[PDB]
Amino acid sequence: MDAHAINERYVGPRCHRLAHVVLPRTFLLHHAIPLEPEIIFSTYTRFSRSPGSSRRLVVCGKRVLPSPSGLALSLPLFSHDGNFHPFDISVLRISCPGSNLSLTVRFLYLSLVVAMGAPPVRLSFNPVNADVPATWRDATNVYSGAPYYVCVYEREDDWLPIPLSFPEEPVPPPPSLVFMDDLFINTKQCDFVDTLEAACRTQGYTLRQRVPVAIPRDAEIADAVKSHFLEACLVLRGLASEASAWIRAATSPACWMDVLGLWESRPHTLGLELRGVNCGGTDGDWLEILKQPDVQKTVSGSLVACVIVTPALEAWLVLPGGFAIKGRYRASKEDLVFIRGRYG
Amino acid sequence: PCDMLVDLDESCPMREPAGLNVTIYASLVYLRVNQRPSMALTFFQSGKGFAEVVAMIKDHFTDVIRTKYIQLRHELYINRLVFGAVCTLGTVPFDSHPVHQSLNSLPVLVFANFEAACGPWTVFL
């Protein structure tokens, strides 16, 4: 509860309003936020119907020990031109400095702005204090459905409500403007797979080897490798994720790899960088890919597929057995501005 | 140089005859790297007789033979078919220990009592 009053002094003047937010364990258990004191939070908001990017601000978070209980934060709210937008996502990115951890937690302003609604010279000494009392108002997250609390601290103030500027006609429907990200990334994945299937047709519905791996001679194994490709087309199309490898490659300034979990046997680990490997496509460059410990297991093993994305937005789908199909993400110049603004 | 030399008699034993004669052979291998033609010269040391070492050299270069001839399913040029050649650089006496040295490091063997006897190149494949 000290973490609210610290941010009013140092995050405060760099913002317009702060959304003082306390996250209970029920919200923490869903997103798997392991409360160590080393975690460095960072916040930025993704605008709608405007050029969407704001500056990243580092926000202090402290665990509250016990009347709720959970992680305490403070989210920045940005009023460009004197008013708030209702459909405007405030993104929280959770990461550790040393170890490998990256989480994205997103909040919408209508779940925040609504919840805010109810002689020697003397030197001034203003310490940080928890003297101000909290008012705890309920909220539910739109994206996961897990409850979190919002603090409203006591201080043309009581006369007005907090401003909003609702969107105007013509408009997409608000279930499709809320998930503006998950409907843009999904149609870049559904058009990526249509390039992978197009390479089968120009070859004659075949899968050719690329990686020298000896395959045991059994007829049931040769029919099982084909089943890993068709399962990989069910997973790449359903995948609409903020942290995919091709978003990391488009916002890069290095091969970006993401392994999949076929038949839901594994959760996905996305955006792994292949440092020291230049995916030129020559046969001497696949030895540097095989020196990675993941591709030795996505190929010798089973039930895991693997996608390796070049910085030129060309990607191979690596199957077990060394079979691969070159595919291409098509990103126009208008969409690179849309991606490098909101994500990079 | 210790890098170029490839020994040939090496066993756990897991028994071979002794003799008076162990012969250093040279080899020179035509290959292609980065779609550009290039050579590779290695050395061999064994007293097994010429009928075994040509079969022992082919087992050493098994991988390099296969990765070249994957190309000529598409283009068959009779000039490209020649692969390697083996000379005989002269004899070494049996049980002379090659003494390791190091120079600037560069590890470099040395052979006592080496006597030279040049031979022709015979084209193995």
């Binding site: 999904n186 519905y205 050719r208 490709f229 359903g238 | -």
Partner: peptide, 29 residues
């Protein structure tokens, strides 16, 4: 016995089971 690695090793994919798989990915999206 194993199969030897070679860049002409092919696996012929059926046309119907690639399209019946395409029907499933429509529904789960």
């Amino acid at each position: 016995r194993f199969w030897a690695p070679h860049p002409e090793n092919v696996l012929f994919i059926h046309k119907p089971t690639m399209e019946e798989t395409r029907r499933v990915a429509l529904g789960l999206r």
